[PDB]
Every structure is written in C-alpha cells, then in structure tokens.
Design a protein around this ligand. Structure first.
Ligand SMILES: [Mg+2]
Lengths: 346, 211, 210
DNA sequence: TATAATGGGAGCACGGATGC
DNA sequence: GCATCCGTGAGTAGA
C-alpha cells in the first residue's frame, strides 16, 4: 500500500557488503571494464556495443532495447550475432568475455547492495519540491554513476566516493525539476544565494531588508534594480484551483477573464469596419480601389510593392503610385463630407 | 595478488596450494563441471540438460540452471534454476489480456451458466456480460492498458498571466510534469541498465503517476 | 471500478490485480517447466519475491566465519542439510560449499634431497624404499651416530625428524638424515670434528610422517 | 571527484453492491 | 448472512 515502506523492504532483502566483498565486486567491475576495452581492441568492434551485449546476456532477454549512443538498433538478432562473434574467439581472447560478464554481474550486485546509502542521504532533502521516492531514484542514478567511476586502488570505502555523486545527483534533480517554470541551475543558485543573503540580513537587522540593503550585502555588481528583477524572475505561479472563500464552492480561476478571444463587441466592430471600408471603396473606380486593396493587403492578406501592382495592372510604378494617391485623396474628400469612418479611429 | 607489486605473494619454489581460514563459506545448490579445455558457455547463460558446457562437447549439463564460469577453480558451475517468464505490472497484465480469445471464454462461461450452483451461475453471468460487451463493441480488452497517454490541449489547462503580472496555472500541468519526469527517468534508467529493484520502483512510481 | 473489468476478464481478485500491477508479486506467463515445493508451476500463478528469486536465480546462502577459526569442510565439497560447515556454523541447505576470502594461504613446497646415515648392520632392516612411519631399524642398545666429516653444523628441524648439514666454507661437505627416535646432540652453528657424535639412536627408529 | 557515512515520518451518515 | 469498500448528502447571491 505505502510505496516507501515496500521499497524499504525490497532494499532490506539485499545484505550489506563486508570490506572484502565490496573490494572484490569493485575489482571485478574495474577489470571488467578493462576486459571490454581489450575485447574492443581484438574484435575491432565498438566498446559500447560489446558492453551492451554482455549486459544484455547478464540481465537476460527480459530487457532488450535500442540505446541512444549505439549506431545499430539492439535486438535479439544483433546481440546473438555479436555474442557468436565473441564466442568465436580463441581461448586466451575468449577469457576477457568471461571477465566482462562477471564484471557486469558484480556491478549489478554492487549497486543493489549500496541502495540503502541513497535512502539515508535522500531523507534529508525532503520538502525541496521533490517527493521522497523521487529523491531516492535520483540518488540511485548518482549511485550508479559512482559505481561506474569508482577506483578501489585508492583504498577508500565505496560509501565515501558514492556519497558525493548521490548528493550531486539529488541537488541537480531538485534544481532541475522543482519549479513549474524551469530556471537554469546557475540562476537557481543565484536566487538561493539571494535568499540566504536576505535571511542573514533579516536575522541581523531584526526586520526584513530592503532591496538596497540586499544589494549592498551581495557585493559589487548588484543594485536594487537587479535584486528586484531577480526576485521577480524567481516568482512561482499560483494554482487556478486555489479555493477562494472557505468552502467547497469556488475556484480562483473562475474569476479570471479571457483576454484572448474577441468579445462580441469586438467582432461586431471589425465586421462593421470591413463593411464600411468596402462601402467607402465602392465610391471609387474598380482599378484604384483594387490598387488600394492590393497595397494595404485587403485582397490576399499581404501588401504589394508599387512594382507588383504596377506589373499587375500593366503600368509604371509612378503611375500606380499616382493612382494610389488620387484614390486616397478621393477617399479623404468622401470622408470629410460624410464623416462615416471617423468613429472607427478610436 | 594485491594493490601494489611489493605486497604480492609469489611462489618461491615448486609446491601445492592450500586455502585455510576463509572469511565466510557460501553454500550454493549447484552442479560442478571441471574443464580441461576451452569452455563453450559464458557466465550468466541459462542451460538445460544435455547442453554442451566445455571441452568441445565432452562435458555437458545434468540439471536446469544458470552458468557461472569459474576461471580460478577452473570449473563450470551450474546453479539450479529455470528460464521461467514471470512478470510484474501492467506489462504482464496487458500481455495476458492480449492472449485472450473472447469467443472461447464465452463458450466456457456458457458451460458455467448451466451449473446447478447459483453462485457459480452468478459469477459466470457477470463475467459473460463483460466478455459479450467487448465482443459486441469490438473493443480489444488490452486497450484497458495504456501505452500512449493522451495529453489535453494547453488552452484547457492554461498557463496565464493575471492582472498583477503573475502566473496562474491548472493542476493538470503539474500532474503531467510528474508523469513526464518519471517516464523519462525510467527510459534513462533502462538505457543505462540499472538493476531490477531500481527499475521496479521506477515503474511503480510511473503507474502511480498515471493514476 | 468494482468489480474490476480487467479482474473480471482475467479471473483475478482485486487483491491479486493490485499485487501484480503495483509490483508486490510476480505472475507466470510461461512456466518453462518450473517446480516449486513439489508442484509444477502453473500458468497465471502468483509468486512472491522469494519464490520467484528461488525459481529464477537459484538457492544459496553465505555463512560468516569467526576470526582465527578454520573451516571443517573442504573447498568445492558437496554438503548435506544439517551438516556442520564449521564449529560455529550449520548449513541450512544441500550443495557445493565455496570458500569466501581465505585469509591464510598455506603452500607446501616440494623438496627432493639426498642424505646419508650410518647404522649397525644387525639393527637395519633391508628395504629398497621406505614409506613414512615405516620402521627403518631397531637398536638393541643405545647407539651413537658419528660425524664422518669436519665443519660447521646447519640443523634443519622438520615436524618430526631432522636434517643435519655439515659445511666447510660455503659448500656443504656432508648431509645426514635423522629419523624419529634419534636425538641430535648438536645445535645450529656448532663446530664438529670427525668421530664426534652428532646424534643418539635409542631403540626403534622410524621414518617421519611428513 | 575519494576519511566514513547504508531501512521514512507523520496522523459522520446511511444504502448498496461485493467479498469471504 | 455479517465483515469489508465506496459514493453522496437543495438553490441563487457573495468572496
Ligand atoms: Mg552592491
């Protein structure tokens, strides 16, 4: 029922590693990677492809999928051909295949064993905008990165190196996924520094700071305007469903007008405008009215140049410009007389 | 061997090697198959009785199981187990739903409709109603499982700038965000070949997200 | 939506459907001739995590060994349920026992050498070769083995029985073998002349076991 | 990019279809 | 037949 509990129990089924066991698995992993490199040298094949094939055989046919980096789609056929091209090697060459297989297996067990560390680290990051389980999974990604990058030669415990990648993964996760409107990680860090700064100032002054005080405390290159804009850009959106009134009745979004779709009054206005413009253009000759319609784009939707209208009516650009002028003039006279199109000018 | 060359153990003269005082002892249910020559199967390969293990086919397998190739002990070990396909979640459920032949089930449930027990007739009827519903409608039952998940047009879950210049948005955007995030993380987890516990957990979370 | 449509079509209870969809239990699409608890696995069977793990990946267990305590069984040797793997360890299952991280490697080095000995003729029992433990000779009265060379003594003591190497300069000038029941009268680095007794043979003397 | 760190945290009502 | 599990419990205004 409760996913956290179920996952804690699934985690508990894997026993913790003794120093000897940990070192062994890490060793098998490193030597494994080296063996994949060697197989890349011998086969003349791609280290990635070979790695994916070995991994596929260790995990089984249960998981088979196309890998983004691979130039070839990974299907049972291809992994079978590659597995056979691997098994067709001489004994001393075929050795590295076994080394690689056991390497992948050791990787799997190393991760599965260190899964608890991720929980113990992630439990401290709750409330940052990400769910517990989400933090656990991201911490798991960190743990995997750590298992791949670890070197047992340095004699350190694995927990030490893994913790760094876990924290890093969780923090990257929170910075990336927390906000509905995504803020780049550096900008997030800036905003947070601004937060801690303003909080320090409010803790020393015994009151909330102004923009100017935060600007001072932030050092050179920061003014009041910059702090204000940074706070403005850090504003998170509010839910349309936030209830207004204390009741089950009302939603905030119900009080917000639609500024996009044209009001019936607007539609009426534009319609009457087109109709009145046509009424005004009918008092001209068809040629000059067509010139005006082509020049202002009432016909095809776009405004033609004088050369295009001149080439359409078969006249010089000067001529068509003069026709445009006399048309506009006759329209201005008709307008001065009838005063019909004035009201639409707003 | 060891981390540094000077700390290695090298044999001075000819001799035989004995291991004592082990850290622990691992008892497995397994069949051991020593090999004097090149081995034909690798670690992790699943094996059924009669399959060639090593030495050009001289040594083969007795039981069903998974092969661990031990180069140190120079033995191919087979841990007894099977190839069973047993799955979890809507993947499994969708599979089972695909394999359904509705006509056959209709026949069987009709046979169950003749049973003297009122309860069995009741259950058979309630089942047959669903069966016949899917039959008449022409709906494939596996359509009850989602592969693609539709997305509502953004205008019906608006992100809008209000009066004061701030933003107001629907909850559907947050839910969709959760879903997309868990999905992408699942794809990347698979692509990097994460272990089974991690993938299982991620899939569970994805389900709860869709829900 | 109760009663479930998926559950009704597949003949699954709300409980079972919940368990499968939420990854609390496996479910069997292709039994592949699996056997659990004596009964072959039927299609559409519900397996727990432990059952599925036992079936798919096999059964095994690791037993911790206390420091400085050696194992009773041998590496690679078959084991029976109930059989003690060590003074503090009893195996719950049957199978092949494997050593996990041996902390001590004992290497027995093979040495083939050539060594002289002198004995009364009546005491000696004639044989072309001697097995370990076999009787080399029997002395009616205490006997003194005398150095037939001069030099400094290198005394190399085995578990039982000893090698005694006489050397002038760097080069060993003599090599003698003292079997069990023969007590060396000299120490390491001692100087001896010819005729000076190295060891005393008292009663029966036999080959060492090693 | 390496001292070691390894299992969460919080929190009324009646009617009706089902399920053991 | 008695243990669950679940869905629903006026209207307009206002805020
Ligand atoms: Mg400043």
């Amino acid at each position: 029922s409760d996913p956290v509990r179920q996952y804690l129990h699934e985690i508990g089924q894997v026993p913790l590693l003794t120093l000897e066991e940990e070192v062994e698995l890490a060793r098998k992993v490193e030597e494994g990677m080296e063996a994949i490199k060697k197989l890349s040298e011998i086969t003349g094949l791609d280290p990635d492809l070979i790695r994916e094939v070995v991994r596929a055989k260790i995990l089984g046919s249960a998981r088979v999928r196309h890998i983004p980096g691979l130039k070839e789609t990974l299907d049972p056929k291809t992994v079978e051909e590659i597995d056979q091209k691997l098994k067709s090697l001489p004994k001393e060459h075929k050795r590295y295949l076994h080394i690689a297989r056991e390497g992948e297996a050791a990787r799997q067990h190393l991760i599965e064993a260190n899964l608890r560390l991720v929980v113990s680290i992630a439990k401290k990051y709750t409330g940052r905008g990400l769910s517990f389980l989400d933090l656990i999974q991201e911490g798991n990604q960190g743990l995997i990165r750590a298992v791949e990058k670890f070197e047992y030669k340095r004699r350190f415990k694995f927990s030490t190196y893994a913790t760094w990648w876990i924290r890093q993964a969780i923090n990257r996760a929170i910075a990336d996924q927390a906000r509905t409107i995504r803020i780049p990680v550096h900008m997030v860090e800036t905003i947070n520094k601004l937060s801690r700064t303003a909080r320090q100032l409010q803790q020393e002054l015994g009151r909330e700071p102004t923009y100017e005080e935060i600007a001072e405390a932030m050092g050179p290159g920061w003014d009041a305007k910059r702090v204000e804009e940074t706070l403005k850009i850090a504003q998170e959106p509010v839910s349309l469903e936030t209830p207004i009134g204390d009741e089950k009745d009302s939603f905030y979004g119900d009080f917000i007008p639609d500024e996009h779709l044209p009001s019936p009054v607007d539609a009426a206005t534009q319609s009457l405008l087109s109709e009145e413009l046509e009424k005004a253009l009918s008092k001209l000759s068809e040629r000059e009215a067509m010139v005006l319609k082509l020049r202002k784009g009432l016909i095809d939707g776009r405004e033609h140049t004088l050369e295009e209208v001149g080439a359409f009516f078969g006249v010089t650009r000067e001529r068509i410009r003069q026709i445009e002028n006399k048309a506009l003039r006759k329209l201005k006279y008709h307008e001065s007389r009838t005063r019909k199109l004035r009201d639409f000018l707003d | 061997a060891a981390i540094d060359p000077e700390e290695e153990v090298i044999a001075e003269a000819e001799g035989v090697v004995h291991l004592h005082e082990p850290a622990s002892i691992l008892v497995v249910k397994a069949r051991v198959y020593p090999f004097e020559d090149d081995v034909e199967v690798s670690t992790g390969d699943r094996v059924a009785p009669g399959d060639v293990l090593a030495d050009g086919g001289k040594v083969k397998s007795d039981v069903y199981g998974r092969v661990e190739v031990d180069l140190v002990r120079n033995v191919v070990r087979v841990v007894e187990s099977y190839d069973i396909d047993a799955r979890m979640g809507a993947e499994a459920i969708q599979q089972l739903l695909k394999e359904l032949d509705l006509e056959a089930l209709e026949k069987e449930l009709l046979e169950e409709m003749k049973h003297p027990s009122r309860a069995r007739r009741a259950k058979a009827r309630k089942r047959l109603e669903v069966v016949r519903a899917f039959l008449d409608s022409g709906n494939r039952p596996e359509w009850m499982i989602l592969e693609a998940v539709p997305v509502l047009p953004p205008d019906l879950r608006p992100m809008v700038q209000v009066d004061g210049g701030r933003f107001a948005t629907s909850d559907l955007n947050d839910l969709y965000r959760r879903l997309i995030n868990r999905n992408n993380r699942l794809k990347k987890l698979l692509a990097q070949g994460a272990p089974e516990i991690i993938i299982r957990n991620e899939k569970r979370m994805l389900q709860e997200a869709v829900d | 939506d109760v009663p479930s449509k998926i559950g009704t079509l597949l003949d699954l209870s709300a409980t079972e459907l919940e368990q499968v969809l939420y990854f609390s239990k496996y479910i069997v699409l292709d039994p592949k001739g699996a056997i659990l608890n004596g009964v072959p696995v039927e299609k559409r069977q519900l397996l727990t995590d432990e059952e599925y793990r036992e079936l798919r990946y096999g059964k095994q267990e690791t037993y911790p060994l206390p420091p400085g305590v050696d194992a009773l069984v041998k590496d690679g040797e078959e084991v029976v349920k109930g059989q003690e793997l060590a003074p503090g360890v009893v195996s719950r299952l049957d199978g092949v026992a494997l050593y996990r991280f041996p902390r001590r490697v004992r290497v027995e080095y093979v040495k083939k050498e050539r060594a002289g000995l002198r004995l009364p003729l009546a005491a000696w029992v004639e044989k072309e070769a001697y097995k370990p433990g076999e009787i080399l000779a029997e002395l009616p009265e205490p006997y003194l083995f005398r150095a037939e060379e001069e030099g400094v003594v290198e005394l190399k003591e085995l578990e039982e029985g000893a090698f005694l190497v006489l050397r002038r300069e760097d080069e060993p000038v003599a090599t003698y073998f003292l079997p069990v029941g023969m007590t060396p009268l000299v120490v390491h680095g001692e100087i001896v002349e010819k005729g000076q007794p190295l060891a005393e043979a008292k009663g029966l003397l036999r080959m060492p076991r090693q």
